[PDB]
């Protein structure tokens, strides 16, 4: 739908007028709407084929593991290998405690 940024405050129609983003989270809030914009500015391209920063790059790989693991848990729950869902529950706790 049509929301505003919880941090910038900026709403999409503001973004249309101003043409400049409010904060990190405006990309989050306008994700759907931005993609036609990027396609147009960068010759159809829309995904970063570039550089991962050093420090936070590894913490972003951990959140990828977490979320893959969150999905293995879900199948295992729709399946009924619950001894193994116990394993994933604790594997996920592991990866979040490493962030802390």
């Amino acid at each position: 739908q049509i929301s505003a940024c919880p941090k910038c405050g900026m709403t999409f129609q503001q973004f249309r007028k101003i043409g400049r983003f409010g904060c990190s989270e405006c990309y989050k809030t306008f994700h759907s709407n931005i993609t036609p914009i990027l396609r147009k500015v960068h010759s159809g391209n829309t995904v970063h084929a570039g550089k991962i920063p050093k420090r936070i790059g590894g913490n972003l790989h951990v959140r990828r593991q977490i979320d893959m693991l969150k999905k293995e848990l879900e199948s295992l729950i729709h399946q009924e290998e619950f001894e193994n869902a116990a394993h994933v529950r604790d594997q996920i706790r592991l990866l979040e405690q490493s962030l802390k």
Binding site: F21, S24, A49, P53, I56
Partner: protein
């Protein structure tokens, strides 16, 4: 000075960056703007990175007007930042590597070298980048890349430029065919015989690919201008 001093005036690398957890310069408060420049005074202003040199923060608030003039001319800052209250320029003694602060984005790293040395400049800028990244949480997103105020910069956040003096190519009427060719090749030219050539896009390519292609095309221009002079 620099490789091809005759032909290429300089090589420029620019990396735009924003704090993740601070509002972009479009909506951030003055207190926010002040904290960024203090975080840069505290953690970077008297620090050496080896090989690049010592950096020294110039607060624009503390800067004499003609000092700002010289910084504008030397291309270390942009004109909007001269009246910016919390704007700043973190500059190397060599004055070749600078880090503009609180302009369109929070951070804009610049490597400005004399010759035709895009790659040396890339390498240097990625060092200042990683250096700052050690102590600053970058506004990054694994799918869209580095996040910037303008969408024309998102992704690599890299603008790469080469400045070239090509008298003979103007005189030989070659220049009229070459600008159209540049554009179709993903680059953009601007301007009596001085042209600046930069990458068009910042999303979907790697920084290697950006500098690579810009370098390749600039190299062929260098050989054409030299061949036109021998004529």
């Amino acid at each position: 000075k620099g490789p091809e001093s005759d032909i290429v005036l300089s090589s420029r690398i620019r990396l735009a960056r924003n704090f993740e957890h601070i509002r972009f310069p479009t909506r951030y408060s003055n207190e926010e703007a002040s904290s960024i420049i203090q975080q840069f005074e505290d953690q970077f202003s008297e620090q050496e990175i080896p090989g690049i040199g010592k950096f020294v923060l110039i607060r624009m608030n503390d800067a004499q007007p003609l000092e700002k003039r010289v910084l504008v001319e030397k291309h270390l800052i942009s004109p909007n930042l001269t009246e910016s209250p919390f704007g700043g320029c973190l500059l190397s003694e060599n004055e070749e590597v600078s880090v503009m602060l609180n302009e369109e984005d929070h951070i804009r790293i610049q490597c400005l070298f004399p010759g035709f040395q895009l790659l040396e400049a890339m390498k240097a800028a990625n060092q200042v980048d990683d250096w700052i990244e050690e102590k600053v949480d970058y506004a990054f997103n694994e799918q869209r890349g580095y996040l910037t105020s303008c969408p024309t910069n998102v992704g690599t956040g890299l603008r790469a430029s080469v400045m070239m003096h090509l008298p003979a190519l103007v005189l030989t009427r070659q220049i009229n065919r070459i600008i159209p060719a540049i554009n179709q090749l993903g680059l953009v030219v601007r301007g009596g015989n001085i042209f600046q050539i930069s990458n068009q896009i910042t999303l979907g390519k790697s920084e290697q690919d950006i500098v690579e292609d810009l370098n390749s095309v600039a190299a062929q221009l260098i050989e054409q201008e030299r061949s036109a002079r021998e004529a």
